Design a protein around this ligand. Structure first.
Ligand SMILES: COc1c(C)c(C)c2onc(C)c2c1C/C=C(\C)CCC(=O)O
Length: 130
């Protein structure tokens, strides 16, 4: 939709703090810190797919809005995820071991803006069309 496309990461603020707050260890945080992934968003019928591609790590989810799904995250957490569309924002929550984190994806001007929150840490990552 407004989201459909191939998106390249162009900026990131506070991602190391976000990963630390999730409990990611040094080696895995090193792999994520300077990565500049592509995010490929597609839709078919009821199913939305978000691919994340980077040199040292690829991930993929496919989901239906409002339907919980199991997810293995890039840092190897086993989480329960639910994604909804609220005011044009794709809102994802991951729940595991009594914790939660949110990942909100929105379109702003030429940007796909992704806000990631864990506790008091907020990370902002911006992608632009490849
Ligand atoms: C790049 O992918 C990685 C990697 C490589 C590492 C090590 C990671 O460790 N923890 C996480 C989480 C993580 C991610 C996904 C990034 C996000 C969900 C941020 C929002 C976005 O930009 O989609």
């Amino acid at each position: 939709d407004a989201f459909v496309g191939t998106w390249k990461l162009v900026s990131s603020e506070n991602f190391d703090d976000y990963m630390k707050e999730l409990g990611v260890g040094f080696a895995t945080r090193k792999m994520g810190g300077m990565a500049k992934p592509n995010c490929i968003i597609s839709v078919n019928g009821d199913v939305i797919t978000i691919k994340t591609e980077s040199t040292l790590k690829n991930t993929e989810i496919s989901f239906i809005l409002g339907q919980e799904f199991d997810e293995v995250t890039a840092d190897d957490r086993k989480v329960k995820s639910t994604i909804t569309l609220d005011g044009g924002v794709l809102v994802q929550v991951q729940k595991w071991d009594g914790k939660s984190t949110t990942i909100k994806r929105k379109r702003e001007d030429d940007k796909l803006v992704v806000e990631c929150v864990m506790k008091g840490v907020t990370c902002t990552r911006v992608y632009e069309r490849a």
